[PDB]
Design an enzyme around this catalytic site. Structure first.
Site, short mmCIF file in Angstrom:
data_model
loop_
_atom_site.label_atom_id
_atom_site.label_comp_id
_atom_site.label_asym_id
_atom_site.label_seq_id
_atom_site.Cartn_x
_atom_site.Cartn_y
_atom_site.Cartn_z
N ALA A 1 -7.95 -3.34 5.78
CA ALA A 1 -9.05 -2.88 4.93
C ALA A 1 -10.37 -2.80 5.68
CB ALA A 1 -9.19 -3.83 3.73
N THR B 1 0.79 -1.28 0.00
CA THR B 1 0.00 0.00 0.00
C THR B 1 0.80 1.29 0.00
OG1 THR B 1 -1.94 -0.88 1.10
CG2 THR B 1 -1.54 1.47 1.34
#
Ligand SMILES: *C(=O)[C@]1([C@@H](O)[C@@H]2C=CCCC2)NC(=O)[C@H](CCO)[C@]1(C)O
Lengths: 233, 250, 212, 198, 244, 204, 242, 241
Positions: C49, C1
């Protein structure tokens, strides 16, 4: 007399009466009329919806509790909501835990017991609503009458609310007839509408004023309101 | 169920009186007389064993109770209320003191505890005040001998000598005449016996009278030997025989 | 990420990659890493997430309730602290989140708050969060100017995510861009890194080491 | 850990605190002010666990400000430090303790003397001429033990700290990105915006 | 149900008054009188012992003057037992404060807390209020000598001289007549005794019927000292002030 | 790791002729780092003295707790608490935290105001009382203190003599302990007066 | 005394009925539902000229698609509004959609009978019924524009038009004759403005009365004074026109 | 455990306990508030049932909830303390979570909520208090004045009064306060306030206290003299006619 013994449900009158319960029963009589009748294949609920103003709606009187059960109310609507919601859970519990549809007779017993707790303890109040429960279970079609006193009874047909006595005498007469209306819903419904009109006086059942519900052999409890009831007016 | 009486049963009236305290005091007035006299070397508390029936065994009923080995109590009013007050007192002496400081509480403090228990029954929800007045006598190292009265309101006051119950007014008057600050324990006992005679209608002997004193340590009543610092209880209930012996010199 | 957000003359630029990995497995190349809290507030997601998606959406619900109650737009300081304080209640339970709360209010102007599951809340001008952060910081630190133009700012952010998507195995997929103005945020497209890379290489002359 | 230093001179207390905030591999900020004003004449610096640090500081700040309003009075530095010590001493035996260390610098307007309090996360409080938390004391205490004097001026105190910071910048492995310095005296709390090269 | 027996100790009268508070005050008005006089160099607390006997032990007695702190004391008018309950919680609050801030509790802070407790029994709980009124005599380094008063309602106020209990009207008028800002502890002690002396419902005013206390800052020291006079000490001052 | 070896420190009490002495070092460190040379470990409530070794925060907390309790005691009992009684209060207060104890080593010293009899006592972290007639040791140098005391000590020493003994016991034990020292203070206690003397010792 | 959840010999709950009496004393509130939106208007009724009228908030937003007007003990409506706003926002968080107007209303009415001193049914901790009635108006895709009257009894009715408050019997009679299935939003506005004027003790102006509406396009909006003043003028003109 | 419904409806639709709560407010000393163009002034009268008090320590009628907001009241003193404490606590909580001090309306809505809640909770009676809350919203210069009552109802006023004889003083204000031209000065505002109180205080230099609240936490109370001076200049306005 009465005045000294009707302050709460936890008090018996000198004659063995429970006035708070009786006063609750009075709220039902002041309620709009509703009828229930069944054959051996179906069970029908016919209810007269009451409106406030001509600018208001006609309050719903039929609540579905499961795919095979439902009821009609007469009296305090909020109390019907509470009781029907308890019935929805009980039906639901039966399905989730035992994978079994709840017997209409069992539902009657559960309602009786829930109502009874509110007639023997301080602080609470009896429910002020009457209910007619219909359903198709493992033993066929059923109709039950629920009184806030906790008394529940199984019948072929009946009516509660204002002027309910008309429809009730009609059914007690039409008995041998409708009890055999098997395999023909429209006939059972018309029979129900004929019984309910036996308690009219004010007006006549209109389209947005009539409310019908049916459940049976291959019919999941369903409600018909408005246009859908036109073919019965 | 569930005690739903969470409000006070004792409240102030327009005049400012606390009805239930008053009524409780009235119950105390009807009670058998009991008294206490403080001497220079001891204290005596006594009352009459008003046996409710000759078939009853008056010994199986003690109106004079030991709270700690140096403190005793007697009362006037409702016997059952007294009995539970004594259980609670004996226990509080432990939980609020002995289990903390390793020693029994001084008279005033235990009296203070009892008084609190009583005050609470005057304000807590769902209860009535205790229908009794206690006379508590005891001794402790830093205060010497003392005598206290505790009333239904929870109020308590130290006395040189006093009486409560039925003939308290007369008895208090008689005590004011005979009391002085040079009385020896035996003298107090004698005065106590005289005062109690005026209040007793029927038989007056060691079987109808209950009397105890707070005096010297009774090593013979300790139950063991080996600890120099443990000399025995100062509280002692007189025997029926001990009383009669003193009644002859009445 | 790789997620970033920076303050400048024209407001705030928010850029994120769109890759999701569980180990060496590329679960997705099309994941949303920016939560539209509401028309004026943006939140970035790094780490867990579910944790980010859940609490940042919940944040929106809290912001909305605030505006109904106070009949006035919530401040970035206050919105960020709501999330921060919530997360702090869970400290030690295992929540995993690296986040940037972005908004532009009249009272505060362009504002960015870094908020993580450790309970840390930091106001700042430039922030990068994720396994690709160091790559984005390199590009950002050497080309950032407060007086950048909205057009140039948008590119800086896009370019920085590109730098990270290239070197970080856990970053890639596409780039999602946002511009935050006092009147709200403006979405600025989804840019596939596959295509974006070759384009940038040719037009910029960078990535000379890669054969194209 | 972060650098938390404090020195009590003749008429003031000076607190110096590192500006860096490092999270893992990166220095996220280099302008962090690790301090909270508890009252007009009391300042608290802190270092420790990531989120606990500010949550504790702001919690204490809230409580002191509330007390100030209720009593329309400013608690003495000693009173404030005891309140803080108790809060930490409770926390240490709780489910999840506050891992925060603090320095409380305050000017007591009643005694007209500056005071410096050092309190670790266990609720260990001590009053000192100068103090620190973490490894800071290891590099600076020998300098302070040497050059410290009870009659130092605020200017002398700043020069001594500058020396301490220089030693820290030479021997300490981590780059703490300098320090923010604040003075607490009879007139309140002010920040020395010029220490980047004083 | 139970409702039937509920007195409802916390409701307003049609006039907006609190029944129980008013009745508790009525109760207090029959309690032995207590007086508080604040001087430039100290404070005086004096109280008349309601009801007494030859046999009552006065050396081991205390029904009106209680030490709360080493710098704060109170005079009680009302139900002794109710007072003790409040006194004890007051003593705890002082210690909690001390432990928390390492400073003795400011006088008003302790008085406000106790009054707040009283106020509670006035708005919720359905319990009777405490039939007690307090006169607080204390010292702190922010306001020096202070004199406060709190009653069943939970309201409190500050005074130079004040009284609680029986004949306060008469007592207040007498105090408002001879009090003077520059008074001295010794002047105050005399004023207090004189006032009680003229308001007593009893024959004469003897020492066995009094409790006396002073909070002074003994010049030869620099600290604050509380002195709860002993029987003989009261007997003495009684003669000196010319009441024999 | 060991809560009792973090801050360091020692306390020792001895009985003499119509007197008692209680002494302690003044160090407060954080393992190898010395932090304060003014951390006294002796406190007093009325005429009763209490020294506490162990985890500093608990030392501070315990003192505040006993000040609190002895204050309420005086208010109710209307007399200052005695050595024997206080010892019981310490024991029960410690045991009350039986499964989450304060990491301290308390020591009580004083003279009974009514019997004039000297009194000392020690406790373990959960309240176990040790009522010695001679001496009591506590702290990170307690082994050394036991050595000093067992040899140096003798009964009925006069105040001036006990002072020399208690001091030499303290001082030489502290110098064999990395976590003790940095100053010392001795309390000589008699029925009427109490003298407090700060000693001169190494500062390393 | 007598329980707060006691039935009268007629089968009514005393507290609920007495509650309705308090509502009668409240300021008037009117709602009109049209296929173009729903209008909600109220009588401010300040008690003194020194009272800044705009601080009178008897019309509040529940969500962008739901608004509501109150009448009676207005302070009792704050927790109802709060519960409503929370229900609507909560629904959205759980289902990523708008809460149906009827659903929102049923939720508010569920609080209604939750009063008593220990009623055996759950934990209804609230000493008395609410002393305020509400007009909930909004729009949703399934049933379009709606107006509901929620009472302290727990029952709620859907109306094409409805008036609550001191001038309700009168205003309702008016609404009976004035309402028809094809009213335009503007007609509704003027109509609400007119009836308020008839039942209000004071002469209706843009300061002692307030209008609002909810439309699918722009949601719930409270008309600022300038906007209403013009509508007032427009009404005076249409009336004087015959 | 005690949960009796003390505040209930009566047949005519009233809640007597809340109604009687108001009666306690009518009995309280008068309080007034008037907002100028750049300030707000709060005035209170001082009873005289007993006089020999120590003004330094006796609790004052105006209380600071925060540095920019104050609250005055009429009614039960013991009751007002409870509301003040809760308000002060809520002020700090707001600053801690929103990182901004409360607006005056927010603080007002909070106090009112607490009051409303005590009118429909079991086992408790309503507050026998009415309040006037004034100050300036953070970074705002527009003056704010609100009023709350036992029922829990609140609203803002240009000027308002509560307590005994508030009827009288309100009339004074209604025919002495022009919204068109509010007391454009701290001085003329304080004057209008003193004037309104004199209509009921009946010569009370020491029976009238005033507090002036300006923007940015600028709050100060006047001394006997400062006020006494206003009184003097006012009695002349009369005699000079
Ligand atoms: C980036 O932080 C992360 C992403 O998979 C998630 C996906 C959606 C929103 C939050 C960010 N998180 C991880 O845990 C991944 C790496 C695991 O080793 C990845 C791709 O870096």
């Amino acid at each position: 007399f009465r005045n000294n013994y009707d302050g709460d449900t936890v008090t018996f009158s000198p004659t063995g009466r429970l006035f708070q319960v009786e006063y609750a029963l009075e709220a039902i009589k002041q309620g709009s009329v509703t009828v229930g009748l069944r054959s051996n294949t179906h069970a029908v609920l016919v209810a007269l919806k009451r409106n406030a103003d001509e600018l208001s709606s006609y309050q719903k009187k039929i609540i579905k509790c499961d795919e095979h059960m439902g009821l009609s109310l007469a009296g305090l609507a909020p109390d019907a909501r509470v009781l029907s919601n308890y019935l929805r859970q009980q039906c639901n519990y039966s399905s989730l835990v035992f994978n079994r549809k709840l017997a209409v007779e069992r539902a009657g017993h559960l309602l009786c017991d829930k109502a009874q707790k509110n007639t023997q303890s301080y602080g609470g109040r009896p429910y002020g609503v009457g209910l007619l429960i219909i359903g198709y279970d493992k033993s066929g079609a059923h109709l039950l009458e629920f009184q806030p006193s906790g008394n529940v009874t199984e019948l072929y047909g009946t009516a509660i609310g204002a002027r309910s006595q008309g429809a009730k005498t009609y059914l007690e007469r039409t008995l041998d007839t409708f009890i055999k209306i098997d395999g023909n819903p429209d006939e059972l419904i018309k029979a129900g509408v004929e019984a309910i009109s036996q308690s009219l006086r004010d007006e006549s059942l209109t389209v947005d004023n009539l409310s019908i519900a049916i459940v049976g052999k291959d019919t999941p409890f369903t409600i018909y309101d408005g246009e859908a009831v036109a073919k019965y007016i | 169920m569930t005690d739903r009486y969470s409000f006070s049963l004792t409240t102030f009236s327009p005049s400012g009186k606390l009805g239930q305290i008053d009524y409780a005091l009235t119950a105390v007035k009807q009670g058998v007389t009991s008294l206490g006299i403080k001497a220079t070397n001891g204290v005596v508390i006594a009352t009459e064993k008003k046996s409710s029936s000759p078939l009853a065994m008056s010994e199986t009923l003690s109106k004079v109770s030991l709270l700690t080995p140096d403190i005793g109590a007697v009362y006037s009013g409702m016997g059952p209320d007294y009995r539970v007050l004594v259980d609670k007192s004996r226990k509080v002496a432990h939980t609020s003191y002995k289990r903390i400081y390793g020693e029994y509480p001084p008279t005033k403090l235990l009296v203070s505890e009892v008084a609190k228990i009583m005050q609470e029954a005057t304000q807590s929800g769902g209860v009535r005040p205790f229908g009794v007045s206690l006379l508590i006598a005891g001794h402790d190292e830093f205060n010497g001998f003392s005598l206290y009265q505790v009333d239904p309101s929870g109020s308590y006051f130290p006395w040189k000598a006093t009486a409560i119950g039925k003939g308290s007014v007369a008895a208090k008057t008689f005590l004011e005449k005979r009391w002085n600050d040079e009385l020896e324990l035996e003298d107090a006992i004698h005065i106590a016996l005289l005062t109690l005679k005026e209040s007793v209608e029927g038989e007056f002997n060691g079987d109808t009278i209950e009397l105890a004193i707070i005096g010297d340590e009774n090593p013979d009543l300790l139950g063991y030997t080996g600890i120099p610092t443990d000399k025995g209880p100062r509280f002692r209930k007189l025997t029926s025989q001990e009383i009669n012996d003193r009644l002859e010199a009445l | 990420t790789t997620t970033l957000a920076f303050r400048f003359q024209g407001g705030i630029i928010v850029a994120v990659d769109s890759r999701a990995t569980a180990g060496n497995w590329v679960a997705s190349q099309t994941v949303k890493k920016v939560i539209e809290i509401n028309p004026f507030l943006l939140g970035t997601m790094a780490g867990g997430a579910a944790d980010c998606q859940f609490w940042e959406t919940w944040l929106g619900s809290q912001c909305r309730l605030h505006e109904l109650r106070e009949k006035e737009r919530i401040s970035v300081a206050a919105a960020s602290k709501i999330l921060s304080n919530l997360v702090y209640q869970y400290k030690g339970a295992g929540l995993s989140m690296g986040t940037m709360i972005c908004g532009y209010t009249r009272k505060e102007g362009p504002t960015i708050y870094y908020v993580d599951s450790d309970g840390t809340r930091l106001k700042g001008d430039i922030f990068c969060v994720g396994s690709g952060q160091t790559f984005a910081y390199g590009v950002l630190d050497s080309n950032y100017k407060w007086d950048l133009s909205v057009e140039d700012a948008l590119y800086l952010g896009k370019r920085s995510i590109l730098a990270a998507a290239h070197r970080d195995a856990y970053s890639g997929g596409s780039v999602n861009l946002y511009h935050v103005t006092e009147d709200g945020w403006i979405y600025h497209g989804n840019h596939d890194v596959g295509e974006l890379f070759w384009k940038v290489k040719e037009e910029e002359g960078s990535f000379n080491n890669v054969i194209g | 850990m972060d650098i938390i230093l404090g020195i009590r001179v003749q008429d003031s207390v000076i607190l110096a605190s590192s500006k860096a905030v490092t999270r893992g591999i990166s220095v996220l900020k280099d302008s962090d002010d690790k301090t909270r004003q508890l009252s007009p004449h009391t300042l608290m610096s802190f270092a420790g666990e990531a989120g606990d640090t500010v949550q504790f500081a702001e919690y204490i700040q809230a409580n002191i400000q509330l007390y100030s309003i209720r009593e329309d009075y400013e608690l003495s530095p000693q009173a404030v430090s005891s309140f803080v010590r108790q809060e930490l001493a409770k926390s240490i035996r709780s489910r999840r303790p506050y891992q925060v260390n603090v320095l409380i610098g305050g000017y007591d307007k009643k005694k007209n003397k500056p005071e410096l309090y050092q309190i670790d996360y266990l609720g260990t409080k001590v009053e000192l001429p100068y103090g620190a938390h973490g490894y800071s004391g290891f590099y600076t205490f020998s300098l302070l033990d040497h050059h410290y004097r009870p009659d130092m001026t605020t200017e002398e105190g700043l020069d001594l700290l500058k020396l301490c910071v220089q030693e820290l910048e030479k021997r300490m492995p981590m780059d703490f990105k300098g320090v923010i310095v604040k003075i607490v005296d009879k007139d309140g709390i002010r920040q020395v915006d010029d220490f980047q090269a004083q | 149900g139970s409702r039937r027996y509920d007195s409802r100790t916390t409701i307003f009268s049609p006039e907006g008054r609190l029944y129980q508070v008013e009745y508790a005050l009525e109760s207090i008005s029959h309690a032995g009188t207590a007086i508080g006089i604040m001087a430039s160099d100290g404070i005086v607390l004096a109280a008349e012992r309601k009801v007494t006997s030859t046999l009552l032990e006065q050396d081991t007695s205390t029904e009106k003057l209680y030490k709360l702190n080493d710098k704060i004391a109170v005079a009680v008018a009302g139900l002794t037992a109710d007072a003790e309950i409040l006194i004890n919680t007051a003593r705890i609050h002082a210690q909690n404060y001390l432990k928390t801030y390492n400073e003795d509790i400011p006088v008003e802070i302790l008085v406000r807390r106790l009054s707040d407790i009283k106020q509670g029994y006035t708005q919720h709980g359905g319990l009777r209020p405490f039939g007690v009124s307090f006169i607080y005599a204390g010292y702190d380094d922010r306001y020096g000598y202070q004199l406060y008063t709190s009653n069943p309602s939970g309201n409190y106020t500050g005074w130079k001289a004040i009284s609680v209990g029986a004949n306060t009207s008469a007592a207040q008028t007498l105090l408002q007549m001879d009090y003077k800002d520059d008074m001295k502890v010794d002047d105050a002690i005399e004023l207090a005794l004189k006032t009680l002396s003229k308001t007593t419902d009893s024959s004469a005013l003897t020492y066995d019927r009094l409790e006396f206390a002073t909070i002074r800052k003994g010049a030869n020291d620099g600290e604050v000292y509380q002195k709860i006079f002993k029987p003989q000490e009261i007997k003495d001052i009684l003669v000196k002030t010319g009441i024999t | 790791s060991d809560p009792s070896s973090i801050n360091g420190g020692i306390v020792v009490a001895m009985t003499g002729k119509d007197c008692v002495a209680i002494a302690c070092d003044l160090r407060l460190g954080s393992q190898s780092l010395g932090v304060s040379n003014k951390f006294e470990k002796i406190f007093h409530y009325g005429h009763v003295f209490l020294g506490i070794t162990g985890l500093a925060t608990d030392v501070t907390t315990l003192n505040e707790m006993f000040r609190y309790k002895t204050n309420l005691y005086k208010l109710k009992e209307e007399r200052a608490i005695e050595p024997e009684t206080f010892t019981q209060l310490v024991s029960s207060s410690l045991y009350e935290r039986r499964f989450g104890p304060y990491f301290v080593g308390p020591v009580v010293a004083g003279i009974n105001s009514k019997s004039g009899k000297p009194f000392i006592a020690g406790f373990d972290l959960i309240g176990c009382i040790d009522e010695a007639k001679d001496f009591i040791v506590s702290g990170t140098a307690s082994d050394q203190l036991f050595g000093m005391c067992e040899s140096l000590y003798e009964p009925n020493l006069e105040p001036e003599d006990l002072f020399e003994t208690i001091s030499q016991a303290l001082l030489n034990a502290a110098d064999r302990d990395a976590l003790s020292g940095w100053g010392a203070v001795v309390y000589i206690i008699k029925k009427d007066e109490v003298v407090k003397r700060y000693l001169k010792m190494r500062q390393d | 005394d007598r329980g707060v959840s006691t039935f009268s010999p007629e089968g009514r709950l005393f507290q609920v009925e007495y509650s309705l009496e308090a509502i009668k004393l409240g300021s008037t509130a009117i709602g009109i539902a049209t296929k173009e939106g729903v209008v909600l208007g109220v009588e401010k009724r300040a008690t003194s000229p020194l009272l800044e009228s705009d601080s009178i908030e008897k019309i509040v937003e529940i969500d962008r698609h739901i608004g509501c007007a109150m009448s009676g003990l207005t302070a009792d409506a704050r927790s109802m509004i709060e519960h409503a706003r929370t229900a609507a926002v909560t629904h959205n968080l759980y289902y990523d959609e708008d809460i149906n107007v009827e659903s929102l209303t049923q939720s508010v009415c569920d609080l209604a009978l939750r009063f008593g001193e220990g009623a055996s049914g759950e934990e209804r901790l609230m000493s008395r019924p609410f002393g305020v009635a509400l007009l909930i108006a909004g729009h949703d895709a399934d049933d379009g524009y709606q107006l509901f009257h929620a009472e302290p009894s727990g029952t709620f009715y859907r109306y094409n038009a409805k008036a609550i408050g001191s001038g309700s019997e009168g205003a309702q009679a008016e609404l009976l004759n004035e309402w028809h299935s094809s009213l335009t939003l503007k007609e509704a506005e003027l109509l609400v403005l007119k009836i308020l004027k008839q039942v209000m003790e004071e002469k209706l102006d843009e300061n002692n009365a307030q209008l609002s509406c909810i439309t699918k396009q722009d949601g719930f909006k409270i008309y600022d004074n300038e906007k209403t003043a013009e509508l007032i003028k427009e009404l005076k003109e249409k009336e004087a026109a015959e | 455990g005690y949960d009796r419904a003390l505040s209930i409806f009566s047949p005519d639709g009233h809640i007597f306990q809340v109604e009687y709560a108001l009666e306690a407010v009518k009995r309280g000393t008068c309080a007034v508030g008037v907002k100028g163009k750049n300030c707000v002034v709060l005035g209170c009268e001082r009873r005289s049932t007993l006089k020999l008090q120590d003004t330094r320590i006796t609790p004052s009628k105006v209380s600071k909830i925060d540095s920019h907001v104050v609250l005055s009241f009429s009614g039960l003193n013991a009751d007002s303390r409870i509301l003040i404490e809760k308000a002060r606590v809520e002020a700090q909580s707001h600053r801690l979570t929103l990182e901004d001090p409360v607006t005056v309306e927010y603080l007002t809505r909070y106090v009112a909520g607490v009051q409303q809640r005590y009118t429909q909770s079991g086992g408790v009676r309503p507050f026998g208090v009415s309040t006037l809350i004034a100050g300036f919203d953070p970074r705002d210069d527009e003056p704010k004045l609100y009023q709350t009552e036992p029922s829990g109802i609140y609203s803002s006023w240009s000027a308002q009064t509560i307590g005994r004889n508030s009827k009288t003083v309100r009339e004074f204000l209604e025919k002495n306060y022009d919204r068109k031209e509010p007391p454009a000065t701290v001085e003329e505002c304080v004057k209008l306030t003193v004037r309104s109180l004199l209509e009921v205080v009946q010569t009370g230099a020491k029976n009238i206290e005033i507090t002036v609240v300006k923007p940015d936490s600028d709050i100060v109370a006047l001394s006997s003299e400062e006020i006494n001076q206003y009184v003097t200049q006012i009695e002349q306005e009369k005699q000079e006619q």
